[model samples]
Target: MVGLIWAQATSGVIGRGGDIPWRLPEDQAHFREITMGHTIVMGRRTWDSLPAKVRPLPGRRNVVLSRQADFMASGAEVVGSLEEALTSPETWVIGGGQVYALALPYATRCEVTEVDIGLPREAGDALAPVLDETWRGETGEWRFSRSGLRYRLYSYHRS
Candidate 1:
């Protein structure tokens, strides 16, 4: 199944300054649980935003999309285009805004952790792809409170 996974604030903010704007350990755990053994495709910037110690994200196959012909990720596959990355079965488009936009049309499911907060858009804040009516929630939102943040996890399938 081709899937997309991400956490975003109510304002559609997924990130700020190349990093997630909130701290919610529960959300992190939720992310790990969902994508643990899947092949994940992301933009070079998203790969770079990962901690140096976990660049490739353990257990999951990492595919990074980059335009640079000489770009290399230490332990991940590098693809020149989104088309190449989508060849993997059971892949998850885990991203920065651009990658998400490119992969959204092909996604069969989306696992989102919706944060109940909003932050001002900054130069580096990565926006998330809008989930429109074409996608319908397959499961009711599961609420969770962690690190003083209220969030919910929702699963949606392309309708």
Candidate 2:
């Protein structure tokens, strides 16, 4: 099954200047818990934004989607399209806006952490087409407090 995992602000902002704007340790832990030992698919930019020390994110296979013929990152496998990445038995689409938009349709599940505040539009790129009418909440949103901010984790499944 294909799944998508991401955290976004109430305004739908998921990234700013190529990085996550918030520093929520619990959310980070949640991400690591769910994605560890799984294949993570992300766009080239998203891969680039990762810290150099953890380039390939240990314990998981990192697949980067890029159009460039020679784009290579030492610890990652580069694919030309989402279709190629989806060939894996179970893959999680991690993002940068364009990649999320492209992979959203093929995703059967989505795990989102919704931060309580709306970020300014200029703060970053908003989540593009994160979900559509075919998806519905699979569970009640669960709240967590971290870094003095209130956030909720929501799970959605295509109906």
Candidate 3:
């Protein structure tokens, strides 16, 4: 049950200048809901991006994938590869672009929140993996976030 979970702008921008382009509490809630009670895997960079207060996200098993010669995640398990992180049956790759790209091949599903905004192609260094035609997507109706941002959920399964 390997899955990739993330939120992206209409331009597929997942990150901009080291931060997400928007602030949507609703999307955060949705993410917490999906990853809770499951093993959430992330790249070292992604783990580092998380606030120190929630480094090892609560209520979930946190696993960090890193290739550093010597690396340690104080409150989480660290693995050397994506395959190693998938040791458990229930795993979700909560990522930065690099990890998401690496985990794409093994992901059975992708949970994406399509934020109603767009960034210039060069404005962001991180983008979501391309959702090609091979995937079947079920998108929900658009909903407005607490911040007044319009967004919607998309559950894409490999077809």
Candidate 4:
């Protein structure tokens, strides 16, 4: 089964140029719970943006999705297409927008970290695709606090 995980801040922003402003503990905890043993697929830019200390995401198998014929990262599998990454028995499509867009249609479930924020018109980057009610069905919710920010963890599946 294929899963897609969407994590964004109260600002309705996932990241600003590959940087997520939230504190690490909360994010890492969320990641640990959902992706610890899964294979994660991400774009070249997203893979490059990872800090050296946190590269490969520890216990997970990291797959970098890029159209470039030959891009490599130690401890990472480079796949030219999403199809290649999704070939595993279970996969997690993590992202930096472009990768999210490509995998949304094929994903069977989603783990969304929804924050309380409005859309910003002046934001330079595109928002994560609005997960319309028609396409998704909620399965669970978990609340957590981090660095004074209160957020909810949500699980969704294709309806």
Per-prediction TM-score to the true structure, in the order listed: 0.92, 0.92, 0.94, 0.86
lDDT of predicted model 2: 0.84
Query: What is the Cα-based TM-score of model 3?
Result: 0.94
What value does the lDDT take at residue 15 in candidate 2? Answer: 88
Q: Give the least accurate 10-residue stretch of model 2, judged by summed lDDT.
A: 123-132
Residue pairs in clash, model 2: none
Q: TM-score for model 1?
A: 0.92
Best candidate (score: lDDT): 3
- Once fitted onto the true fold, the runs of candidate 1 whose alpha carbons sit more than 4 angstroms away are 138-142
Clashing residue pair totals per candidate (backbone < 3 A): 0, 0, 0, 0
lDDT of 2 by residue, 47-145 (tens): 999889989989999999999979988899998988988776888888978888898878888998888876866844657454668888854455767
**Which pairs clash (backbone N, Cα, C closer than 3 Å) in model 4?**
none
Tens digits of per-residue lDDT, candidate 4, 1-159, equal: 788887776556887655665554676677778888888998888898888888889888899987888887888999888888877788988887888889887887878786654535346563575677646565445455656655676777774
Model 3 error, position 144 (Å): 0.7
User: What C-alpha lDDT values do all the predictions have?
Assistant: 0.84, 0.84, 0.87, 0.75
Residue 83 in model 2: shift from native, Å? 0.9
Candidate closer to the true structure by TM-score (higher is better), 1 or 4: 1
Question: Which regions of candidate 3 fall more than 4 Å away from where they truly are?
Answer: none
